[PDB]
Amino acid sequence: HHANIDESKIKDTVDDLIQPLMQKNNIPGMSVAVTVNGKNYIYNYGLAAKQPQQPVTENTLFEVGSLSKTFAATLASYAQVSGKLSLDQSVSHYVPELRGSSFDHVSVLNVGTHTSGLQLFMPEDIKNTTQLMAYLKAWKPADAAGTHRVYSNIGTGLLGMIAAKSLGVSYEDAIEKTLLPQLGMHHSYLKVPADQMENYAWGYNKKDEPVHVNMEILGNEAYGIKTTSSDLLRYVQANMGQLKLAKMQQALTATHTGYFKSGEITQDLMWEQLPYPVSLPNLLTGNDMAMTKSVATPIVPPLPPQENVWINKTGSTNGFGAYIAFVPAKKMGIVMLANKNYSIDQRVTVAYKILSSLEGNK
Ligand SMILES: *P(=O)(O)OC[C@H]1O[C@@H](n2cnc3c(N)ncnc32)[C@H](O)[C@@H]1O
């Protein structure tokens, strides 16, 4: 602790919110990463595993659940800026087995914005590509694609699958061999390697059992990433153009294009945003859209990537709870990782309090 140092003030702000949060929710371990003024701060708390006990360190890997959807979008955006994908084309244009199905009328943009109408969860009985394609050929949305927003793991799966195919590789290769390496995210994985298993935190479910996420079909696209807070802070900085990584920077920025309004949010390519300065009530409402259908209204022409917005994404698994938010105009961002799935309203509120503390009022 030092005087006249913003770092000590930030640590106090973060500690004072995170310690009670972890106590009352019984969260075993967290890492919080903050960037502001071009400086990066990483704060680690508690335990990556209870038995045998292992502390959270700079190397601890957390499951981030739906933060993974933003990587599928970044890959699709990379394919798009590389000339391999048009977001306005239909899904069946790129997946010829689906020609003649309802996917003749669902665009890639629809699956990238949760506006196809596909339901939230993949049917549990779908285990292989044959069963998946049979389901998709038989599926019909309740409303015309493009009229409603239904947050969807399945649609995100299609987005990433199409993006990878357009690049000539599997999704796993696209992410681990192309995207994460080009972003400099060397401790981010869909499959944690043997030399990193000691760093892979256990998640603690509602009954406090240690669990790791089970990876099923198209799951890598929707929920597969394990990563460190430092790697995600780099991802946040890259999303704010702060790093010397040109196609990749274009791809990152273009994911922030605003395509639909729904409720309080602007739906980008997987990322979600609200105008900044943003009120806590609207941010909370905008982060309570995970399981219900809402009306979606197109933004056409699309809203270009903005500076004056709060861009964010939640992610969870049975054992983990994560959140990212950043405001490009202020070059400030936060990553909050936990090995217990605690409520989104608390993640958002803590992040709002932290970011609001980072400069004076004017
Ligand atoms: P985001 O973190 O909002 O959502 C992804 C998490 O939802 C759960 N989940 C999605 N899809 C499935 C399937 N098919 N089976 C079991 N669980 C699923 C996971 O917790 C994801 O991490």
3-state SS assignment for residue 70:
helix
Residue nearest to atom 1 of ligand 1 (CA): 66
Using CA atoms, how far apart are residues 107 and 96, in angstroms rounded to an integer? 14
The answer to whether 357 is a known ligand-binding residue is no
Going by C-alpha positions, the residue among 242, 290, 229, 303 that lies closest to residue 263 is: 290
Using CA atoms, how far apart are residues 295 and 290, in angstroms rounded to an integer? 14
The answer to whether 90 is a known ligand-binding residue is no
Breaks in the chain after residues (C–N exceeding 2.5 Å): 245
How many angstroms does the Cα of residue 329 sit away from the middle of ligand 1? Answer: 32
Please give the positions annotated as active site: 66, 151
Structure tokens at 237: 């900085």
How many angstroms does the Cα of residue 2 sit away from the middle of ligand 1? Answer: 43
Residue 153 CA, distance from chain mean position: 12
Q: Report the residue among 316, 344, 347 best suited for mutation to probe ligand 1: largest number of ligand atoms under 8 A from its CB.
A: 316
Going by C-alpha positions, the residue among 211, 188, 229, 197 that lies closest to residue 337 is: 229
Structure tokens at 361: 């009022």
Give Cβ neighbours of residue 99 (< 8 Å, ≥ 6 apart).
92
3-state SS assignment for residue 152:
coil
The answer to whether 152 is a known ligand-binding residue is no
- Residues near ligand 1 (Cβ within 6 A): 65-66, 121-122, 153, 213, 216, 222-223, 290, 314-318
How many angstroms does the Cα of residue 355 sit away from the middle of ligand 1? Answer: 28
3-state SS assignment for residue 53:
strand
Where in the chain are the domains?
1-362
| Gyration radius (Cα) of the chain, Å | 20
Tell me the CA distances in angstroms from 32 to 166, 211, 242, 310, 339, one per residue in order. Answer: 35, 21, 19, 18, 12
What string of DSSP letters covers 325-361?
EEEGGGTEEEEEEESB---HHHHHHHHHHHHHTTS--
Using CA atoms, how far apart are residues 360 and 330, in angstroms rounded to an integer? 12
Would you report the helix, strand and coil content of the chain in percent, each value rounded to 5?
A: 40, 25, 40
DSSP run (H or E) holding 9: helix 6-25
Residue nearest to atom 12 of ligand 1 (CA): 121
Residue nearest to atom 4 of ligand 1 (CA): 66
How many angstroms does the Cα of residue 294 sit away from the middle of ligand 1? Answer: 20
3-state SS assignment for residue 112:
helix
Structure tokens at 62: 């957390």
- Structure determination technique employed: X-ray
How many angstroms does the Cα of residue 362 sit away from the middle of ligand 1? Answer: 41
DSSP run (H or E) holding 15: helix 6-25
- Residue pair 226/189 in contact (Cβ under 8 Å)? The answer is yes
3-state SS assignment for residue 215:
coil
**215-218, Cβ contacts within 8 angstroms, sequence gap of 24 or more:** 215/190, 216/122, 216/127, 217/122, 217/126, 217/127, 217/128, 217/129, 217/132, 217/157, 218/122, 218/132, 218/153, 218/154, 218/156, 218/157, 218/158, 218/160, 218/161
Tell me the CA distances in angstroms from 255 to 9, 74, 352, one per residue in order. Answer: 33, 6, 22
Using CA atoms, how far apart are residues 271 and 254, in angstroms rounded to an integer? 10
Backbone angles phi, psi at 61, to 5 degrees: -95, 130
**193-197, Cβ contacts within 8 angstroms, sequence gap of 24 or more:** 196/59, 196/61
Residue nearest to atom 18 of ligand 1 (CA): 121
Using CA atoms, how far apart are residues 80 and 149, in angstroms rounded to an integer? 23
**4-10, Cβ contacts within 8 angstroms, sequence gap of 24 or more:** 6/36, 6/37, 6/39, 7/39, 7/41, 9/357, 10/34, 10/36, 10/41, 10/354, 10/357, 10/358
DSSP class of residue 200? Answer: B
- Residue pair 228/42 in contact (Cβ under 8 Å)? The answer is no
Give Cβ neighbours of residue 246 (< 8 Å, ≥ 6 apart).
none
Secondary-structure class of domain 1-362 per CATH: alpha beta
Residue 65 CA: which ligand 1 atom is closest? 22
Burial 62-88 (b: 16+ CB within 10 A, else e): bbbbbbbbbbbbbbbbbbbbeebbebe
Using CA atoms, how far apart are residues 346 and 336, in angstroms rounded to an integer? 11
Going by C-alpha positions, the residue among 323, 308, 335, 250 that lies closest to residue 79 is: 250
- Residue pair 261/60 in contact (Cβ under 8 Å)? The answer is no
The answer to whether 262 is a known ligand-binding residue is no
Per DSSP (E only), the strands in 73-147 are none
